[PDB]
Design a protein around this motif. Structure first.
Motif, short mmCIF file in Angstrom:
data_model
loop_
_atom_site.label_atom_id
_atom_site.label_comp_id
_atom_site.label_asym_id
_atom_site.label_seq_id
_atom_site.Cartn_x
_atom_site.Cartn_y
_atom_site.Cartn_z
N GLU A 19 40.41 44.50 33.62
CA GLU A 19 39.03 44.81 34.01
C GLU A 19 38.06 44.50 32.89
O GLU A 19 36.89 44.20 33.15
N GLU A 52 32.76 47.04 36.93
CA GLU A 52 34.05 46.86 36.27
C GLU A 52 34.15 47.68 34.97
O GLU A 52 35.22 48.24 34.70
N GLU A 93 39.32 39.14 42.48
CA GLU A 93 39.09 40.35 43.27
C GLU A 93 40.17 40.56 44.31
O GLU A 93 40.77 41.62 44.46
N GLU A 96 43.50 41.73 42.93
CA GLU A 96 43.46 43.14 42.58
C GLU A 96 43.59 44.13 43.72
O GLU A 96 44.37 45.08 43.54
N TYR A 101 46.56 46.65 42.35
CA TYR A 101 46.34 48.07 42.57
C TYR A 101 47.23 48.74 43.58
O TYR A 101 47.58 49.89 43.32
N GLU A 127 36.97 46.98 45.03
CA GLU A 127 37.33 45.62 44.79
C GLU A 127 37.30 44.77 46.04
O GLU A 127 36.95 43.59 45.90
ZN ZN Z 1 38.26 44.89 39.19
#
Ligand code: ZN
Ligand code: FE
Ligand code: FE
Ligand code: FE
Ligand code: FE
Ligand code: ZN
Lengths: 190, 190
Positions: A19, A52, A93, A96, A101, A127
């Motif tokens: 990030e 971010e 993006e 992520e 994530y 995101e």
């Molecule tokens: Zn991010």
């Protein structure tokens, strides 16, 4: 429980590192969109860079320790024209919220860190809208629809707030005399 | 022709002086809206303050001279709660586009300054949307609709970009843990 010596501990540091670099890349991309004549896109890049910073802050505030080795792949560069910058940012993006994530929230769960799994899943929601915003703008550029629509709308000068009615943004704002680059579609969200 | 010794010369300085004070008042009001728990309103005040800098800049760039005496009435103060601040700012806005700038554009015309009459009339357009924005927000506060609607929408955290679906903004953002104050209705203007 403690975080130290878990896989989630290494995943929070990896997410913070990715990030922190995205904050920098979006600010650089923000400067290039300004030079390309796209001020509203320049400011979205800068707003996203800022967001971010905050996702990285929430993450960082969990860490408790010393030094930690990370093994991780990152984009090794490139500041290009704004359209390519928008496409490379949507992609980052994209990875992520679909891969990184998900996976990190899942491991945190396995390990007894439900609140961090919560925060990891919640950042992914953010995101996703960021990728959608970069994609709509990239699409506007490519079709030539940034400063001209097919039907007549209201265009706002971001520099002085002048509202213009038309199919396209004027060449120079009549109130502040700044060029077309400053105009956006007029938006109301209250 | 020259501007020196015309009534428009004194009117441009009066407009610059009133705008310079509005830039300051909107920034002060911006600080108080932040303390009242209204972040999106705080940033609109600051954006408007900034736009007042630019209208004042276009004006100032016409002046050519030395010292000039102005006789003029200005609001002698008051930073109050955000609702009253929004109502006093709509009023100031209101007077500018209905009375001051009309009148000044008309005198400039009479005197042979059509381009300044143009700029004066164009700033008024901007001043009308600013009054409408302050009024809609003042109305949202008063009705208790800033953070809760009757039908379910999407709410965005301005601090981290988290999108929430519901009738109202959550008490704390789940991604960045900042409070309700940070949420706005999600807006799309591209
Ligand atoms: Zn991010
Ligand atoms: Fe993002
Ligand atoms: Fe303008
Ligand atoms: Fe105004
Ligand atoms: Fe948030
Ligand atoms: Zn004004």
């Amino acid at each position: 429980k403690s975080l130290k010596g878990s896989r989630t501990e290494k995943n929070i540091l990896t997410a913070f590192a990715g990030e922190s670099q995205a904050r920098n890349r979006y600010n650089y991309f923000g400067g290039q969109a300004k030079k390309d004549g796209f001020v509203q896109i320049s400011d979205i890049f800068a707003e996203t860079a800022d967001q971010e910073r905050e996702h990285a802050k929430r993450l960082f505030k969990f860490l408790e320790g010393g030094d930690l080795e990370i093994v991780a792949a990152f984009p090794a560069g490139i500041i290009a024209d704004t359209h390519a910058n928008l496409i490379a940012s949507a992609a980052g993006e994209h990875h992520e919220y679909t891969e990184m994530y998900p996976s990190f929230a899942r491991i945190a769960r396995e390990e007894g860190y439900e609140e961090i799994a919560r925060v990891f899943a919640s950042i992914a929601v953010a995101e996703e809208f960021h990728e959608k915003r970069f994609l709509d703008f990239a699409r506007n550029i490519k079709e030539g629809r940034v400063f001209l629509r097919e039907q007549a709308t209201k265009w706002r000068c971001r520099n002085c707030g002048y509202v213009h009615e038309g199919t396209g943004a004027p060449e120079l704002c009549p109130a502040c005399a700044h060029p077309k680059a400053h105009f956006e579609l007029l938006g109301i969200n209250w």
